[PDB]
Structures are given as structure tokens and as C-alpha cells.
């Protein structure tokens, strides 16, 4: 998240690109980050995010 924000602050990407990247990060935590293996319950949250994507 912080790296996306610093990337926006440098000016490489647009603010729309920043917001879309944040949405992708928060909707693809399992893919971008290996969280589910260490805590199984976390998987539920992941599905929430994907469901929310399907909602939006």
C-alpha cells in the first residue's frame, strides 16, 4: 500500500491509477500476499473482498 502511494507521489502514475491499484491490492491480497496458509480463517476475509468486488 505504501509503495503504491509513493509511486503516485513520485508522479509515475495518475491518481486514478493509484485508486485502482489500491482497489486491486485490497481485492487480491491472497494472490499478491501469501496470507491464507499461515492463518486459515483469513481465507474467509479474502472471499469477502472478492465478493465485494463482484458487488462493485
Amino acid at each position: 500500500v505504501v509503495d503504491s502511494h509513493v509511486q503516485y507521489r513520485l508522479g509515475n502514475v495518475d491518481a486514478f491509477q493509484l485508486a485502482d491499484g489500491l482497489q486491486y491490492i485490497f481485492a487480491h491480497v491472497g494472490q499478491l500476499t501469501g496470507m491464507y496458509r499461515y492463518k486459515y480463517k483469513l481465507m474467509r476475509q479474502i472471499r469477502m473482498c472478492k465478493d465485494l468486488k463482484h458487488l462493485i
Partner: protein, 156 residues
């Protein structure tokens, strides 16, 4: 106590009894949670926050809490919705930024070197027509809209 110049914490974290450091390291998940919950909104370019930092630089919490007025927040996010839809309709070749920003082992960027003097390109603020949005165009896109106005909010 009183707030100190931001250069002091900058120098401390630049330069770096291990018991104090180790004990400070314990509360790191609070640091993560407070950093993430104070995350800037899409309509903000810079969001200055009060920060409680360890004297040794071992940790730094974002002190404040994201207090937002519910109708103003919902209206701002509705304007964001409109602007996002307009931009996605405009840009056929929208390019998502690299999923893993920066190198896997790229040293972290120094804020005082390449972020401090760079001004933001723009925000996602929706353009407000002065004839209809007259009462709100003055503060619709502030970090905290009416924080300094005594009439509309209780206070600081």
C-alpha cells in the same frame, strides 16, 4: 509535551540498551493498523497526521483516528464514483500500476530525497458547479471539512 519539528524524527530514523528498542518493537501491529486506518482518501493529495514516534526510531504510530462526517463522507465517495466511471469510460487503455511496486529488494525510498520536494500531480476531486454546490464547494474536498469552524462542528 508539545509537537517537535519533523526533521528530528527524520534524522533519528536516518541514523538507525537494546531493552528499550525491543520493548518498543512489541506494539508493531498497532503501528500497522493505525497507519492503514489513517490511509489518505482518493480526493486528498497530502494528508498530514499527528505521529507518536519512539525516541530510538524503533516504531512510529499515527496518533489520530479517521473521524469523518457520514453524509460528507458518503457524498465525497459518490463524487468519487462518478469521477471513476467517467475516467474509465474515457480511458480505453487504462494501465494498472505494477502489482508489486518497486523491486523485490529495492532499498526503501528516502522521503526527504525524492518525495519531499515532489508536488502531487492532481487529485480525483470532482468539479463542482458553483450555482448548485454553493454551500459545499468551499470545504467538500478538505482533509477534515469543517474542523476549524465552530458553528458546524463542536471543535477540534
Amino acid at each position: 509535551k508539545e509537537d517537535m519539528p519533523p526533521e528530528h524524527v527524520r534524522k533519528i530514523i536516518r541514523d538507525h540498551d537494546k531493552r528499550v528498542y525491543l520493548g518498543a518493537l512489541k506494539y508493531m501491529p498497532h503501528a500497522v493498523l493505525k497507519l492503514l486506518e489513517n490511509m489518505p482518501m482518493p480526493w486528498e493529495q497530502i494528508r498530514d497526521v499527528p505521529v507518536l514516534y519512539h525516541i530510538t526510531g524503533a516504531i512510529s504510530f499515527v496518533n489520530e483516528i479517521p473521524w469523518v462526517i457520514e453524509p460528507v463522507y458518503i457524498s465525497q465517495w459518490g463524487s468519487m464514483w462518478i469521477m471513476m466511471r467517467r475516467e474509465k469510460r474515457d480511458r480505453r487503455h487504462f494501465k494498472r500500476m505494477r502489482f508489486p511496486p518497486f523491486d523485490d529488494e529495492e532499498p526503501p525510498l528516502d522521503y526527504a530525497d525524492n518525495i519531499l520536494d515532489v508536488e502531487p500531480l492532481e487529485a480525483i476531486q470532482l468539479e463542482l458547479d458553483p450555482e448548485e454546490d454553493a454551500p459545499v464547494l468551499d470545504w467538500f474536498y478538505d482533509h477534515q471539512p469543517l474542523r476549524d469552524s465552530r458553528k458546524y462542528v463542536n471543535g477540534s
